[PDB]
């Protein structure tokens with residue numbers, strides 16, 4: 001069970017606590033319809049993470065990239081952190097724009113269930129996705145780096161509309 | 174104990190199995206002293222991972238970067254994977270040149286031990302570092318992506334010379 005726990009702490013230490021302090025400055029640079037101030041992280045509990053989000057939903061299209069963030073990390077000179085800006089559609093209309101991406105460790109949970117050596121049952125994929133979201137929420141609720149700049153979007157599919165799911169959180173702000 | 178196990182599986186799923194198939198073609202492009210054909214991964218058991226490798230050792234200097242590897246990953250368009258080429262010195266002489274980097278999850282192990290919320294004891298970071306190397310070694314031995322293109326350098330330091338440690342693995346090949 002500690003797998004999803006460590007991945008959530010990994011996700012915060014080696015990513016969120018590094019890019020969240022510099023995000024609002026990157027969004028301001030791109031603006032100068034404006035882009036929302038927060039980073040919206042998609043958390044599909046089925047751990048189904050497509051690499052191309054524009055084709056995953058017709059009402060979600062890639063718009064542009066943010067200016068890249070670079071830094072020396074673990075002996076890698078100028079390791080690049082890049083983020084994408086997406087437009088959310090509603091009845092053929094641009095309803096909102098924001099920085100949108102999936103939580104990558106959910107891909108790791110999915111692949112571990114496929115591998116036999118990983119000791120990770122296929123049935124345990126849902127509860128680890130749940131534990132990943134609970135641990136990540138606990139971290140961000142007490143995170144100094146998280147100051148109204150990060151919004152988690154967790155959902156479960158059984159019709160469901162992903163673009164309508166993101167627009168709900170976007171309008172709440 | 175399952176924390177380091179999941180970080181090692183993450184390290185292979187979301188990184189090693191993505192860049193190792195492309196590494197030899199990237200090293201050849203740079204060559205056209207030649208650079209070695211394997212990715213050399215430093216595994217300090219004390220989990221002390223500096224971000225600037227050149228500062229850590231006077232006999233290890235940064236030389237150049239490889240051509241960047243990009244790809245759409247989890248909704249992030251053109252996510253960048255970059256690797257650095259280092260030169261290793263011995264008595265004021267260039268003794269070797271290779272692609273060298275630390276295993277970043279060891280930084281995650283170090284940071285979890287300092288956070289109280291992580292449920293990770295200070296004393297347990299050497300134990301988790303040993304499990305991370307053991308799990309990663311088991312994966313790469315059975316990894317089809319790893320075909321004698323990856324070399325792990327685990328070491329425990331109480332004098333110790335890191336550049337001398339890397340050269341030993343280089344000269345075996």
Ligand SMILES: Nc1ncnc2c1ncn2[C@@H]1O[C@@H]2COP(=O)(O)O[C@@H]3[C@H](O)[C@@H](COP(=O)(O)O[C@H]2[C@H]1O)O[C@H]3n1ccc(=O)[nH]c1=O
Nearest residue numbers: 010011014015080081082104105183184187188249277278
């Ligand atoms: N540019 C980015 N775009 C979107 N997400 C990012 C980015 N950077 C970090 N993250 C998240 O942060 C997590 C932990 O990052 P990390 O601590 O660096 O350790 C990585 C992990 O243990 C394992 C799997 O990778 P994942 O991507 O699945 O997990 C990371 C992302 O979830 O391979 C490690 N690894 C990956 C690549 C690299 O270049 N060197 C490196 O060492």
